[PDB]
Amino acid sequence: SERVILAYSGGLDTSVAISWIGKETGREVVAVAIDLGQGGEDMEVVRQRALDCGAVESIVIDARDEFANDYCVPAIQSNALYMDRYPLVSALSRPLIVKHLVKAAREHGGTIVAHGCTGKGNDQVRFEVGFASLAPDLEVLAPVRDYAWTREKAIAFAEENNIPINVTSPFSIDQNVWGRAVETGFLEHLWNAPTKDVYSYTEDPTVNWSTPDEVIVGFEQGVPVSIDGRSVTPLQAIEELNRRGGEQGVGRLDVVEDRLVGIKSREIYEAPGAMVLITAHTELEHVTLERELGRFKRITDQKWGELVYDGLWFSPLKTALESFVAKTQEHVTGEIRMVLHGGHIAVNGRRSPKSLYDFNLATYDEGDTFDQSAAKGFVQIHGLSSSISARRDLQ
Amino acid sequence: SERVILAYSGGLDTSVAISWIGKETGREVVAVAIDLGQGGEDMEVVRQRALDCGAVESIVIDARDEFANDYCVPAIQSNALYMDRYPLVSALSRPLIVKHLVKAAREHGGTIVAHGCTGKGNDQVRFEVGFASLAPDLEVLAPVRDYAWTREKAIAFAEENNIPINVTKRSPFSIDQNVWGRAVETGFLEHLWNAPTKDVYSYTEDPTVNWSTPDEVIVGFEQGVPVSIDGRSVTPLQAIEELNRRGGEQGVGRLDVVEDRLVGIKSREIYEAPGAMVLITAHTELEHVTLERELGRFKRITDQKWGELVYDGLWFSPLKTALESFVAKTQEHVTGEIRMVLHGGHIAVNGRRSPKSLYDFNLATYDEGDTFDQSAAKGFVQIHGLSSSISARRDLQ
Amino acid sequence: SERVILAYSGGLDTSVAISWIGKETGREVVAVAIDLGQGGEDMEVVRQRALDCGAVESIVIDARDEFANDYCVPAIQSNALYMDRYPLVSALSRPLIVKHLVKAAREHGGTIVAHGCTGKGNDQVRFEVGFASLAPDLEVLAPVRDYAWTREKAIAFAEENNIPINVTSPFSIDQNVWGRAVETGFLEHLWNAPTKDVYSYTEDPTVNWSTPDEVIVGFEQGVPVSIDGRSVTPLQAIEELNRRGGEQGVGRLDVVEDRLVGIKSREIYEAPGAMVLITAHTELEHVTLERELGRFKRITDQKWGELVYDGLWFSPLKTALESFVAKTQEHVTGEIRMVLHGGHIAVNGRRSPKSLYDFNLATYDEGDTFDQSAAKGFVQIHGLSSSISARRDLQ
Amino acid sequence: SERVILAYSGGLDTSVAISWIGKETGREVVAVAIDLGQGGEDMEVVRQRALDCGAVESIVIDARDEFANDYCVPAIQSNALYMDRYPLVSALSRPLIVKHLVKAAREHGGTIVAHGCTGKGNDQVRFEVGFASLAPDLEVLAPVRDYAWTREKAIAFAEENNIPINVTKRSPFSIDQNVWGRAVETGFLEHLWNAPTKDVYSYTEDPTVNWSTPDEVIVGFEQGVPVSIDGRSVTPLQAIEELNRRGGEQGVGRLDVVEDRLVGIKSREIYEAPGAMVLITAHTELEHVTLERELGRFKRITDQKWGELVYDGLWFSPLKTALESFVAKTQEHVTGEIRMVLHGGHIAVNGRRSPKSLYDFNLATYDEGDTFDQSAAKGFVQIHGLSSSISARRDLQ
Ligand SMILES: Nc1ncnc2c1ncn2[C@@H]1O[C@H](COP(=O)(O)OP(=O)(O)NP(=O)(O)O)[C@@H](O)[C@H]1O
Ligand SMILES: Nc1ncnc2c1ncn2[C@@H]1O[C@H](COP(=O)(O)OP(=O)(O)NP(=O)(O)O)[C@@H](O)[C@H]1O
Ligand SMILES: Nc1ncnc2c1ncn2[C@@H]1O[C@H](COP(=O)(O)OP(=O)(O)NP(=O)(O)O)[C@@H](O)[C@H]1O
Ligand SMILES: Nc1ncnc2c1ncn2[C@@H]1O[C@H](COP(=O)(O)OP(=O)(O)NP(=O)(O)O)[C@@H](O)[C@H]1O
Ligand SMILES: NC(=[NH2+])NCCC[C@H](N)C(=O)O
Ligand SMILES: NC(=[NH2+])NCCC[C@H](N)C(=O)O
Ligand SMILES: NC(=[NH2+])NCCC[C@H](N)C(=O)O
Ligand SMILES: NC(=[NH2+])NCCC[C@H](N)C(=O)O
Ligand SMILES: [Mg+2]
Ligand SMILES: [Mg+2]
Ligand SMILES: [Mg+2]
Ligand SMILES: [Mg+2]
Ligand SMILES: [Mg+2]
Ligand SMILES: [Mg+2]
Incomplete structure (x- = not known):
């Protein structure tokens, strides 16, 4: 029906975009919101907002398990740490959002997809390279980048058209079950340290002085499957380790990173569960993978992380590396014991039925x-x- | 006079080895002890022991600054972490010991060099590949690997030949330590489900001890060399020692690693390397500020390769030497200061500044x-x- | 029955080894000869020789198709050129020989396997690492390396025990359907050029002045499947291109190579079919593989060739690289046209139903x-x- | 005087572009023509044409030796073969042109630099990344890509504004050539099942022509630089030219490549690079004699990366510069002579000798x-x- 399918987050810009896109194009807009565990408002409140802001259809996709199973677990299996620092918090979700937006387009007669990314980030790359690989027939609209878009213009448009939207914190937050990313003006200066107000997923690393948390994480063929002997799904593993790691201040990251678009930027991340899982998985590979295979796999781990950061999740090199990785994970089975304490992850035990330690x-x-x-x-x-x-x- | 030059640590085994090598070869022995900051007994006490055990000459080389400057600083510049875990504590010192043993051989008429490494470790490789590269004319004698030299054979030999040596009790720990770090192997820790206990640590305090007083530290580099701490100028050795103390007080640099030995087996070791880990962490953060993206991506490859070469006993190999030329160029603008908090056994970066920053x-x-x-x-x-x-x-x- | 299973080539040393091993060990010897297309004597003449020299059992395994399908085709798919020069002529056959020797041991009650490799080559590594991976329970006997073995001693032993063996050319030749390797004393001096007498698989590159041979080689998922539109098996492809390339002097190689055992050595190779196949396969990848995948695959091609040269065919890194390679070959389908002439392979045409050329x-x-x-x-x-x-x- | 500095080749399009840029910008134009051994018209005829088309200054830079010494020799030392096929014929000259255009801008008061590259090639990248690295203050003008400058618009402009230029017939060939090699693009060859015909070749004869007289040649290197042919000392430019002649007579260095452009598409090109292929082949053979095994394995990685960087317009990038430091160290002992037979379009090595040989x-x-x-x-x-x-x-x- 010549619809625009909007990747809809519920915020001011994408909410105004619904009627703005309608006017600019003359087309109806289907809003698609993905639950990746970002929390905050109930997803139904988000879904309803898009309708009130003029969407002809508004859908919520609960993709939390899919995100854990098909995006986070591959990142664990390639020990993915961009810059040897960052477990790709925001990068991992973008190909999943792309996948669901294309699916929604096929279902709802969309010929155009739209996103609210800016022109100086990585996310525009991840979205648009993804669309170009999965569905080149779809026009891609980037209203926030390509149409002289400003907050004031969006607010003026909302006022003129009585769009019911909150237009009232200096933090730029992106969070999901895999981690949390924080940008703020103050931290654009590299000699400024973050303050307690930047954090949410994790407690201050000083809290639990006499109550460290020793945890055992079990893997089967590279997939996290147990915590302290209890079976878990990958989503459950991530959530439990987010909680237990977060209570110990684990996974607080402060990184100067190279954006694909040519500049360095400073960002704060909280990724307690991710860091516990990647650390444990690495330790288990040291027990279960032969020496020279391990040396080369550190090269492919790095390359994989670069590909995904660079918006190349769907690239043929990434896909071929996944075939390599799948073979390496055949025997990556066992349990890793770590102490979580003081913002630190300290391995102190391994056991495996596939051990190469003799x-x-x-x-x-x-x-x-x-x-x-x-x-x-x-x-x-x-x-x-x-x-x-x-x-x-x-x- | 066709002497044997012995890499002498001062231990019981190599001490009795001096006398034993003398009778078994009929050659004079020169003992060479290298001060790398291993502490323990005074070096002069060590020097004298060799003489009392029959060495015709016994020398001590203070190599602490040379070690920091010419071995530890290169490891920092390549962010060297074997297995992405280990800053090469025992591996780094071996080529420096080799160099000095060769120099001692030339000066004291040695035709044979001897070491006390075993046949299942990496150190035999580092010594013997080193000797083969620097001085292939020298015969290499390995009593422990090749002539079944043991503690028992030593205790027995010293009693039978009336050697004036005090027989110390056996330690449960196999320990190697120097100013760059400490390595501990124990029987108990050969089981991978056994955690270490407090008695395996020495360089570092438990993270809980000084928990109430986190230590924020600024480390400055010039062209990739550590040159200041909290604004104070330091030599590389002083940088290492100060950060050993400050990191140690916070339990930083406690490592517990299952690694791949070059000789084909995995093994489990405990390391303490507080200063090394602070320096390598800070150096890496500074490169993220001062090195361009694609140079940085490729340098993570050469960082890994360099660590492998040095672990594998290939410090003197032409690939290692050529990588050093690559690294030297990359370090030209790696100048600036990194601010970190040491606490909880953890190193947390929270500040950077640089006159060579690529951040805009x-x-x-x-x-x-x-x-x-x-x-x-x-x-x-x-x-x-x-x-x-x-x-x-x-x-x- | 506590047998020794000997990898038996039919030559003086392994023929004498049969009764020498019998005396040294007190055990019966099963001789196993593999047909890899080495030509020369009929395989039955070889089989019979082992019996006449005292083998209790003597078997011939015709492994030509298996060699082509399972060893040469993987080498083609990784464009394997050691030193960027050598398509692993002698290296590729060793894991196959190992496989069949282990199989023979299981069948004939062997507890020991034996080979006639020397102590300064690569082949001892390829055999013994292979045995250690496939069958560590088997004792491995290396009489020519480990037992003060000399030609004179072998001949004296043969004389003393009336072993019926020819004990009467200064060329050290190893050949199979994949190529031919030649060592001679004269060529151990690097300023000495090879003479016409060194060659057998190929004609002098000057012969066919006005009769070049244009050939089209077709691949399906990385496997050679046609020549000039005619369907062929991989063995047939290799044999036809050996003939056609050989008639044009193609695949004459003269290499200074790094042995894994620490020394450089100079060798002559003839590998006409191999070089045509690897060249064509590379050209087809340039048409069918995306840029960055191709850049990385040149790294894995090199690594694969090193692994196989280094006696690590059965290593887990090699096996994992094969999973990577298999994915890359999915679309490596098409035809490459080349002129074979003057010792040279000149590509001049490509077509593919999976082309990325637009x-x-x-x-x-x-x-x-x-x-x-x-x-x-x-x-x-x-x-x-x-x-x-x-x-x-x-x- | 706020001049435009034009990378001037002498062709119709850029010639009329001079006049056109003048009217469209109101600025004076300085034409800079670089002699890289492209042959064709005499450079002074080229220089004069720019003046006649309205250039306020017109200069010619003889850069043939600089090109050989500082661009071709580095490519030889990294055995540079893009796709493992192409020795970077057109890619290598671009950073040298950039350098000279920047120098000309500083000397003649230029604030704008202009080039005639299209929007679907690699050369736009090599020029513009180069300008951004060496002289970011200079505005870059790209008439062909950004202002629809075509042959037709040029032929039309020259007739309307009475420009004293002779309009040459269009060639079916898009050709770029210099002393290092020749590149040919034709419409006919955009179809991958079309083979080239004899009319696309110029630098080389058909292999059949001199088939009866194979040419055995010895090429000598000192520290990775070509310094002799058949015992005769030569400069690098002389080495390239002599081997262009001798290889060309034997049909050597004919290449037909499907390559990956950095701008995301594949394309098919014919190259002739007889001298380059002889030099890179010989250089590789010499490294097999003079470089240790593992250094050689890793250098094949850096060889590939270097070729990619230069192809991708990253000659001036810090990774390329750092790789040059690596390469310089590797070349220290790459000294010796390689004997080859040129015949049948083929290069066949049959001899090596070296005073730095690792062959024992x-x-x-x-x-x-x-x-x-x-x-x-x-x-x-x-x-x-x-x-x-x-x-x-x-x-x-
Ligand atoms: N969970 C999601 N479901 C659907 N689309 C999403 C989701 N998260 C992000 N997007 C899309 O990704 C784009 C960029 O994400 P983000 O950086 O979070 O921008 P925003 O949410 O539009 N603005 P902000 O309020 O500052 O986060 C958004 O504009 C949406 O188009
Ligand atoms: N500081 C040193 N100066 C000279 N030689 C040394 C030094 N440290 C180690 N070595 C040599 O390296 C060998 C292996 O090191 P090590 O594992 O420390 O052996 P050891 O000291 O003989 N045994 P132990 O008493 O258990 O430490 C020693 O036997 C000496 O030959
Ligand atoms: N086709 C084969 N079938 C079985 N075993 C083989 C075969 N080819 C090689 N071998 C084994 O590989 C070993 C080394 O091969 P080679 O270098 O050919 O030595 P050889 O054949 O024993 N001596 P030579 O006559 O000089 O070739 C041989 O000694 C055999 O044990
Ligand atoms: N020798 C040179 N001296 C100066 N500028 C050059 C030289 N060679 C190439 N260029 C510049 O590089 C651009 C692209 O090169 P080319 O593809 O050769 O363009 P052209 O010469 O303008 N077109 P053509 O006549 O078809 O070769 C040219 O337009 C010039 O701006
Ligand atoms: N605060 C944010 N919204 N960050 C989003 C991007 C995070 C990170 N720099 C990335 O490229 O993946
Ligand atoms: N406990 C020890 N003595 N360890 C010495 C060796 C340490 C470390 N595994 C290395 O190879 O460098
Ligand atoms: N002439 C020979 N027998 N050569 C056998 C070995 C060939 C080659 N050097 C390799 O290691 O694979
Ligand atoms: N026919 C030409 N003008 N080719 C110029 C470019 C040649 C080659 N494709 C390169 O990118 O370097
Ligand atoms: Mg958002
Ligand atoms: Mg890494
Ligand atoms: Mg000791
Ligand atoms: Mg044989
Ligand atoms: Mg290669
Ligand atoms: Mg031109």
């Missing part, structure tokens, strides 16, 4: 099975090519 | 001073996504 | 669909981070 | 002089294979 090869005790007679010859040949090079250097 | 407030900000030209973005996104879009179209066709 | 995006003709309005903005942001770095450098 | 005859040989200690091999194999053996055991358990 006590008898490692021990000096009576059970020692390592044949040391091999070592002299190994060292001689291991060192030979660089020895020959050194001789030449010195000649 | 006006390009990043949303305030009135915003200079970012957003008109470029639509086109950038179209072309950045185009090759994968074409691939997707083919996939779906 | 004529209309590339052309300047009337059909041009490239939107150039995007380019200014792309260049501005692509260049921004290094521009900012340059500004800092210059300040 | 006695370690390799099976003759009586054999020095390889085989007793080390069994142990090496046991430990080399151990981690994958343990993994296999777990897999099978």
Whole structure:
């Protein structure tokens, strides 16, 4: 029916965009809001807002389990830490939102999709490269980037058209079950430290002095499946570790990162459950993956994180890396014990039915099975090519 | 006089090895003890012990500053973390010991060098590849690996040959320590479900002890070298020692790692490296402010490779040497200060400043001073996504 | 029955080894000879020789198709060129020989396997790492390396025990359907050029002046499946291109390579079919694989070739790379036209039903669909981070 | 005087662009023509044409040696082959043109630089990223991409404004050539099942022509720089030109490539680069003789990355610059001679010699002089294979 399908968050800009897009294009607007565990307002209140702001149809998709299962678990399996710091909090959800917006377009006669991203962020890239890969036939509208859009203009438009919207905190927040990101003007200066007011997912790391939390996280083929012996879904694992890590101030990040669009920016993140899961998963790989496979997998972990940050979730390199990763995870099964305390994650135990750790090869005790007679010859040949090079250097 | 040059630590085993090597080879032994900040017994007491055990010469080399400057600083510049966990505590010192043992051989007429490493560790590799690179003419003697030299054989030899040595009780800990960090291996910790207890720690206090007084510290670098702490100029050795103290008081740098040995097996070790972890963390944060994006992405690859080379006994290899040329160029503008809070066993960055910053407030900000030209973005996104879009179209066709 | 299973090539050393191993160990010997297309003597003549030299059982395994399908085709799919020169001629067959020797051990009550490799080559590594991965319970005997073995000693042993064996050319040859390797004393000097006598698989590149051979090689999901429109099996593809490439002197290689055991050595190879197949497969990937996937796949191609050279065919990194490769090959389907002439392979045509080449995006003709309005903005942001770095450098 | 500095090739389009830019901007134009060995019209004829078309100044820079020394030699040292096919013919010259255009701007009071690249090629990127790095104060004008400047608009403008220019017939070939190689694009070859015909070639003869007389050539390097041919000393430019001639006579360096443009599309191009391919082939062979194994493995990674950076318009990027520091160290011992036969369009190596060789005859040989200690091999194999053996055991358990 030649609709515009709007990725709808419930905020001022996308709410005004509904009738603004209607006027600019002459088309009806279907609002699509995704529950990723962002909390705050009930999703029905968001759904209703889009209707009151002129959407012909307004839908909520509960994608929390899908987000955990199909986006967060892959990030865990590639130990994804952008800059070796950031578990891709905002980046991971964008391809999922894209997927559902395309699906909604097929269902509701949409020929255009729209998003409210700005022109100096990464999110525009993640949305628009995604749309171009999944549905190039759809026109993509970026009203906030491409149409001389300002808050004042949006508010003036809302006033002129009696749009029922709240137009009344200096924090720019993005949160979901995987983590929370905070931008504020004060923190754009790199010598300014964050204050307690920036935080929500986590308690101050000083709170629980005599009550550390020791937790055991179990994985089966790279997927988190248990906490302290209790079976859990991936969403439940993330939520429980968000709570337990958050109570210990774990996962507070303060990062200067390279945006794909050419600039550095400073951001604050809270990602307690994510950091516990990625740390544990890494420790389990050290127990279950052979040396040279592990060395190379640190390269593919890094590449994967870059691809997803760079808006290339749907790229063929990312997809092929997933086939590599799936094979590596076959035996990544076992339990990792960590103490959560003081904002810190401290591993102190591992066990695995797929362990490559061999006590008898490692021990000096009576059970020692390592044949040391091999070592002299190994060292001689291991060192030979660089020895020959050194001789030449010195000649 | 065709001497044996012994890498001498002062321990019972290598002490009795001096006398034993003398009888078994008929050669004179020169003991060389290197001060790397291992503490323990005074070096002169160590030096004398070798003499009393039959060494014809016994020397001590104070290499603490050389170690910090020429080994620890390179590790900082490559953010060296083996397994992404371990800043190479025991690995770093080995090439420096090799260098000095070779120098001692040339000066004291040595034709044989000896070490006390075992046959299932990495240190044998680091020593012997080093010797093969720096001085292939020297024969290498490894009594522990190749001639079954044990504590028992040593205690027995010293009693049978009336060697004036005091036999110390056996420790449950296998410990290697220097100014850069401390490594602990115990039988109990060979079981991966056993957690360490407080008795394995020495360099660091439990995080709970000084919990009430978090320590905010500023570390300054110039061209990738640590040069100041809280505004005070320091040498690299002083930087390491001060941050060992301050991080140690906060329980920072406690590591518990299952690592891949080059000799094909996994093993579990405890490390304490408070100063090293503060320096490497701060250095990494400073590179995020001062190195361009794609240079940074590739340097994480070379950082990893460098750590592997040094772990694998390849400090002197031509790839390691060539990576150092790459690293030196990258460090030219790695100058600035990083502010961190040490608390709870954790290092928390909360500030950066740099006269070489690539951060541009006006390009990043949303305030009135915003200079970012957003008109470029639509086109950038179209072309950045185009090759994968074409691939997707083919996939779906 | 506590047998030794010998990897049996039919030569002097392994023939004498049969009764020598029998005396040294007191065990019966099962000889296992693999047909990899090495030609020369009929395989039955080889089988019979082992019996006459004292083997209790002697078997021939015809593994030519298996070698092509399961070892050569993976090498094609990773464009495997060691040193960017050598398509792993001798390296590829070793894991296959290992596989069949282990199988024979299970069938014939073998507790020991034996091979005739020397101590300064790569082949000992490929055999023994393979045995250690597939069957660590088997003792591995290396009589030629570990038992003070010399040709004179072997001949003296044969004389003393009346072993019926030929004990009478200075070439050290290893050949199979994938290629031919030649070692000779004269060529151990790097300023010595090879003479015509070193060659067998290929004609001199000067022969066919006015009769070049244009060939079309077709692939389906990375597997060679046609030549000049004719369907072929992978073995048939290799054999036909060996012939056609060989007639044009294609695939003559002269390489200084790094052995895993620490030394450089000089070797001559003939690999006409292999080089045609790998060249064509590479050209087809340039047509069918997206840019950044191709850039990364050149890294995995190199790593794969190193792993196989280094005796790590069965390693978990190699196996995981195969999962990566399998995904990349999904659309590597199409035909590559090349001229074979003068020792050279010259591509001059491609076609593919899975092509990523878009004529209309590339052309300047009337059909041009490239939107150039995007380019200014792309260049501005692509260049921004290094521009900012340059500004800092210059300040 | 707020001049426009025009990267001037001498072609019809940019010639009329001079006059057109003058009227459209009211600014004076300075034309800068760079001699990179493109041949064709005499540079002074080119220089004069710009003046006749209204340029206030017209200069010619002979950059042939600078190009060989500072751009082609780095490409040789990184064995630069884009797609593992293309030695960057057109990509290499762009940063050198940028440098000279910036220098000309400073000298002649230019505030604007202009180029004639299109919006779907790589050259726009190489020019504009270059300008943004070297001289961000300069405005960049791109008439072809941004102001619809075409041949037709040029032929029309020159007739309407009485411009004293001779209008040459359109070529079916889009050609870019310099001393390093030649690139040809034709409509016919935009179809991937069309083979090139003899008329697309110029730098090289058909391989059949001189088939009866194969050319054996020795190329010598010193620290990775080509310095001799058949014993005769040469400059890098002389090396390139001589091997262009000798390889060209044998049909060497004919390339036909489907490549990935940075702007997201594939395209098909023909190249002729006889001298470049001989030099890069020889340089690679020499590294196999003079660089240690693991250094060589990693350098194939940096070789690939360097070629990508330069293709992608990132010659001036800090990763490229840092890789150059890595490369310089690797080249220290890349000294020696490589003997090849040029014939049949093919380059066939058949000899190497080097005073810095890592080849050791006695370690390799099976003759009586054999020095390889085989007793080390069994142990090496046991430990080399151990981690994958343990993994296999777990897999099978
Ligand atoms: N949960 C969601 N469901 C649907 N669309 C979403 C969701 N989250 C984000 N988006 C889309 O992503 C765009 C960018 O997200 P964001 O950076 O959160 O901007 P916003 O929500 O529009 N403004 P703000 O109130 O500042 O967060 C939004 O404009 C929406 O179009
Ligand atoms: N500071 C040093 N100066 C000289 N040689 C050293 C030094 N530290 C270690 N070595 C050498 O390295 C070998 C292995 O180190 P280590 O594992 O510390 O052995 P050890 O000291 O002999 N045994 P232990 O008493 O248990 O520490 C020693 O046997 C010495 O040969
Ligand atoms: N086709 C095969 N079937 C079985 N075993 C084989 C085969 N090819 C090689 N081998 C084994 O691989 C070992 C090394 O191969 P090679 O280098 O060919 O040595 P050889 O054949 O024993 N001596 P030579 O006559 O010089 O080739 C041989 O000794 C055999 O044990
Ligand atoms: N030798 C040179 N000296 C100066 N500027 C150059 C030179 N070669 C190329 N350029 C610049 O690079 C741009 C693109 O190169 P090219 O593709 O050769 O364009 P053209 O020469 O204008 N068109 P054509 O006549 O078809 O070759 C040219 O328009 C000039 O601006
Ligand atoms: N505060 C925010 N809204 N941040 C959104 C982006 C977060 C992070 N910089 C990313 O690119 O993924
Ligand atoms: N406890 C010890 N002595 N450890 C020494 C070795 C430490 C560490 N595993 C290394 O290889 O460098
Ligand atoms: N002439 C030979 N037998 N060569 C066998 C080995 C060939 C090659 N150097 C490899 O390691 O694979
Ligand atoms: N025919 C041409 N003018 N080609 C110029 C570009 C050549 C090559 N594709 C490059 O990007 O460097
Ligand atoms: Mg929002
Ligand atoms: Mg990493
Ligand atoms: Mg010690
Ligand atoms: Mg043979
Ligand atoms: Mg390669
Ligand atoms: Mg031109």
